[PDB]
Symmetry: C2
Subunit: 110 residues, 2 copies
């Protein structure tokens, strides 16, 4: 089950929900989120874990470079947690309008 | 600091984003999420941590019942996580359509 993942592992999945990324690209995406450095020794063992759990697939481009992508299971985990989060956040009309605005503005910036 | 919370602590904040709740009520909402029992020894020390961080307020009610609610800081942390999650998930028009359906269905069920 994916609901037991650590916050750091879920954030990797969130990053890859946007698009498949090289390991180094995931690291900088996480660093922009956390506002502090993400060590190589924290990211890559957790990438390994998610690959072994069946949530991420690894494509070997070169020695010292790989691309990571969500599996179907991984995407299901991302959508499952988003649904649960929204089921609790969308608690009244004001909350509905707030999310509608977030999504619309996110779309506009694409 | 809020972006450094554990998955369990973030899930507590999510639960209280829906509405204020007694400790016992938080426990069962989390149990429904995880599909497994949540021990008192895990929930309550984490609630105390969130209170100490200023993200939850503990209202001590009559006769040994406590009710927990988000502070303004706690609500900020829930929205900030949701915005980051949505910024990564809403990557194209089909992703936007899926989120908008989830939000609308949730609102309709209220
Ligand atoms: Cl965690
Ligand atoms: Cl973590
Ligand atoms: Cl990349
Ligand atoms: Cl890599
Ligand atoms: Cl790169
Ligand atoms: Cl780190
Ligand atoms: Cl490594
Ligand atoms: Cl989520
Ligand atoms: Cl759900
Ligand atoms: Cl509504
Ligand atoms: Cl709101
Ligand atoms: Cl956790
Ligand atoms: Cl979480
Ligand atoms: Cl309650
Ligand atoms: Cl209890
Ligand atoms: Cl109760
Ligand atoms: Cl804090
Ligand atoms: Cl308090
Ligand atoms: Cl964001
Ligand atoms: Cl989609």
């Amino acid at each position: 089950d994916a609901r037991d993942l650590t916050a750091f592992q879920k954030n990797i999945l969130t990053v890859l929900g946007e698009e498949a990324r090289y390991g180094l690209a995931i690291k900088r995406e996480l660093e922009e989120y956390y506002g502090e450095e993400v060590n190589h020794g924290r990211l890559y063992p957790n990438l390994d874990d998610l690959v072994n759990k069946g949530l991420v697939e690894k494509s070997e481009l070169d020695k010292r470079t790989n691309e990571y992508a969500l599996t179907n299971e991984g995407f299901d985990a991302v959508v499952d947690d988003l649904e649960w989060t929204l089921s609790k956040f969308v608690a009244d009309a004001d909350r509905r309008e707030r999310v509608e605005t977030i999504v619309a503005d996110d779309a506009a910036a694409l």
